[PDB]
Design a protein around this nucleic acid. Structure first.
Ligand SMILES: Nc1ncnc2c1ncn2[C@@H]1O[C@H](COP(=O)(O)OP(=O)(O)O)[C@@H](O)[C@H]1O
Ligand SMILES: Nc1ncnc2c1ncn2[C@@H]1O[C@H](COP(=O)(O)OP(=O)(O)O)[C@@H](O)[C@H]1O
Ligand SMILES: Nc1ncnc2c1ncn2[C@@H]1O[C@H](COP(=O)(O)OP(=O)(O)O)[C@@H](O)[C@H]1O
Ligand SMILES: Nc1ncnc2c1ncn2[C@@H]1O[C@H](COP(=O)(O)OP(=O)(O)O)[C@@H](O)[C@H]1O
Ligand SMILES: [Mg+2]
Ligand SMILES: [Mg+2]
Ligand SMILES: [Mg+2]
Ligand SMILES: [Mg+2]
Lengths: 264, 264, 264, 264
DNA sequence: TCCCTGTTTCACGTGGAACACCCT
DNA sequence: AGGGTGTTCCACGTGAAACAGGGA
């Protein structure tokens, strides 16, 4: 039993991290794999998108990072039996201060998530972490605990530099804390293929990263999440799109992403 | 005179903060008012949108907040003679550590931007600050230095929640540090009027906030930024839309926002 | 009393003449007024629509107009007690030859329906005549026997012309044979309001004829027959829509037409 | 050089005869065959559908049937070089009277169109005649002039009866005037395949006529003209949909009909 | 070089209709 | 059988964007 830990990360906000994390988790569960999703963002969209309103949540991931609880007590089960969730809440916005308090004394604070996870890394196939928007303490925790990193990219101008900064952050940690950190793939999100800016931004990214881009093993096609109002309406129903609408282009793209992850 | 300081702020990223700040700054410069735009985001998309490479940038606003420099030495003149810029760079990601130490030291980190701002408030008509996506120390400094706040809102499922969060921080600061802090307007961005999700999100926001939504004085119409790829392409040219294409509906909408701000 | 005689007439076929004639007859019969529907079409769709098999057809209207019989021996009772029928037959196609023999002679042939009708005009409240698709001798007899005229209109490219053609005939007969003949209304059929061609034809008709269009007295709304597959399947059951499905939109529209006529 | 004469005929109005005659003519001309289309309806919708309004026409088919002129002087050229038209006008409504005068004397009146046509039967590949709505003298001349007959069928209840009647008219003329008359095919028009009324009427027709229904040369699939608002807008442009939009489903169906006619 | 036009393609909202469950 | 639902499926209208060319 070993779980692969995959962080979905991008300092930039609004690029599809939470949409990807939730729907990739559900898409991997349908292939009868056991999935643990970790909302690592204080606003807690992944939690809300699975129907847990964060008025209702009592104990957070934050409580676990404090040692105030063990991760086994915070886990919640979802409408899908093979998808459980460690929820979030705005209390985790305290973690930033704790991080620096850690830096004050201890050479410790980068691995508060890795240590919180050790309890369960052997009871799931995949642990998917939904990261917040920055290269701050929460995202560094996220990347320091992960085997693999999924980078969802919206194909507009700021994605260019945005990636650069992100990758340098990974490679410093590849020499730092987490030498095993791997990029599992780039994933274009909200993808509108006919727009000129999209064609140019993807061309410029391909020039350096074509190797990194997610592909369909059967056909070798790129896998990209189309822009689809169905995927934006999904959180309004507390469900991932494969329960909410299984043949939408958005849902099909996320299930192809699951299979490609499933090759290796 | 005395500058009015407007923060462009929102709990979420990717909702058009940087787009609104840049294009509002430029649209007020056309009516020949003198404007300073402050990139207050470590990713620094505002800087990048006005054509400044971030490597070419030497000493940033971070230095100014740290006292290594004073705000007058970092200002740069732009392709618009009536629009200057305080550039940013990821070095400003250091500020949050400073922030917590400052609050540890003497409850001091929330007005370090306001103090850095005293040097120049009487040399501009408008100072526009573009803040990062969270309610973190940088955004807190932005809202604590400002007289008024523009909230750009993308009309998707979490907009209600996110704004509630932002408004509850604004209300803590009006009772704390900046009591005259005012809401200058909500501004719907990337607005696609035909989508059901858009109409539903706008109906729910109107029920609580119609009063705050920017309106064109002439006709009483709402001001909404249309979805317009020209606006996403403009920063790859280092220009604001009125220089890249002044007849775009995105450019027309931002000139209507500029005029509405100028009426009072 | 005197029965009011309404011709359902229009230069072109397939615009709904038979459907409105039949269902208007039934919808007025529900208000317990006694009505005779006169199939004046050799194809005899009204006959078949009330369940009469044309094997059972033995003595037609054609027999009556030649004097072979009087209108009272051809009438038949229908499943509605307040609705009887003069059936038709392809034998009625013989009448046009008779017509020209007639006009060769004595200006005789335009009123042969009117004369065959006065044997019974004091035994019904309404006489509804279902005319054939042209401005030929049968339709000429129909419009020459009638007090009022219903014009069903399918809203496609040639409707304008058709009505103009029909109108010119009506109005030559108003100075010729039947001077009190009046237009009781235009009635849009098979109406699907979303089509651009529907909108364009209705605008073109409104500009010349708005006054003539049937209206619901209660609200002043136009009465238009919706396109409704139920109304096309009803005659396969030998029924009018009010017996085949009373809550269909077709039946509701025809009952509002009935009510509007009952007002005068 | 022998021209094949094809009548487009059906007693019922509004079933697509003129739409079929026009678009079949145009679809055959594009296959480099020379086509003469004959408007045999006094309302003259085929003529107007090719852009010649009926105010503008000088001498019509009627003048020719009376012998007042010869068919070569009434012909008109179309926007397509391989399709000419003998136009119509409401003067042809006089022909019914002419027919019966003929009947008094000579057993002739059934072939006055056949007589008018011999003058040109050797200068066209196909002569397509667009018939009026009844089994009156005009349709009789049409079927007595033809080698073959195309029967367009709208699949509603009245197509059952109507069909039987038309065939008897043909079988009687196959014993009367035109012994080589053949039906080249049934053609379902305005076809909406999912409607239950459609499935049932086609089933009842297939039971007697499956062999007669038009089929695709290549696959043996039925050829049916889909219900398409583009085909109803087509006369609004004075053009057949082959020029007005050659990729609409209506246009594709008619060009498949042309190819199938062209196999034999 | 600018900028006018028309045409094509695409996602989304809309509503009539067949249908598989539903109640009972 | 009767009287909901809600679900899928289709054609059509709409509006943003790309584009081809047309234009002195
Ligand atoms: N493929 C897509 N098409 C349309 N909208 C999307 C898509 N993916 C995400 N969204 C919407 O975009 C917004 C940002 O997505 P989210 O996953 O919350 O990004 P992040 O977690 O990176 O901040 C949300 O409104 C979300 O529902
Ligand atoms: N009205 C608009 N239409 C189309 N794209 C837009 C619009 N406004 C912003 N964008 C694009 O959306 C992306 C995210 O917006 P940005 O302004 O950087 O917001 P934030 O500062 O909140 O992350 C950028 O690629 C930007 O060019
Ligand atoms: N409102 C309607 N919706 C759907 N089908 C209709 C409607 N009105 C008529 N029909 C059908 O259209 C066909 C033509 O109508 P019909 O009443 O026979 O026309 P006409 O008598 O003018 O030739 C018939 O099959 C009829 O069932
Ligand atoms: N396949 C089709 N889809 C939609 N409308 C059609 C179609 N065929 C014909 N129409 C329209 O139906 C009406 C009747 O067609 P038409 O060819 O005039 O029949 P007819 O010649 O038998 O009287 C016209 O408005 C016509 O444009
Ligand atoms: Mg998120
Ligand atoms: Mg920004
Ligand atoms: Mg009829
Ligand atoms: Mg016709």
């Amino acid at each position: 039993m070993m779980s692969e830990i995959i962080a979905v990360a991008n300092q930039k906000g609004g690029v599809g991290k939470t949409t990807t994390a939730v729907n990739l988790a559900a898409s991997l569960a349908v292939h009868e794999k056991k999935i643990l999703l970790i909302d690592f963002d204080p606003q807690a969209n992944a939690t809300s998108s699975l129907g847990f309103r964060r008025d209702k949540i009592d104990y957070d991931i934050y409580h676990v990072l404090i040692g105030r609880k063990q991760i086994s007590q915070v886990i919640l089960k979802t409408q899908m039996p093979f998808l459980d969730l460690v929820p979030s809440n705005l209390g985790l916005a305290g973690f930033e201060k704790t991080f620096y308090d850690s830096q004050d004394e201890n050479k410790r604070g980068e691995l508060m998530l890795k240590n919180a996870l050790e309890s369960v890394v052997g009871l799931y196939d995949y642990i998917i972490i939904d990261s917040p928007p920055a290269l701050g303490p929460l995202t560094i925790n996220s990347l320091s605990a992960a085997h693999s990193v999924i980078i969802p990219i919206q194909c507009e101008f700021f994605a260019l530099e945005g990636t650069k900064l992100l990758l340098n952050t990974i490679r410093m940690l590849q020499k730092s804390t987490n030498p095993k950190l791997k990029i599992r793939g780039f994933l274009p999100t909200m993808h509108v293929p006919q727009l000129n800016l999209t064609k140019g931004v993807l061309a410029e990214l391909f020039k350096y990263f074509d190797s990194e881009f997610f592909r369909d093993s059967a056909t070798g096609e790129y896998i990209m999440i189309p822009k689809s109002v169905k995927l934006a309406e999904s959180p309004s129903f507390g469900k991932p799109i494969l329960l909410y609408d299984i043949k939408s282009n958005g849902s099909i793209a996320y299930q192809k992403l699951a299979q490609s992850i499933l090759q290796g």
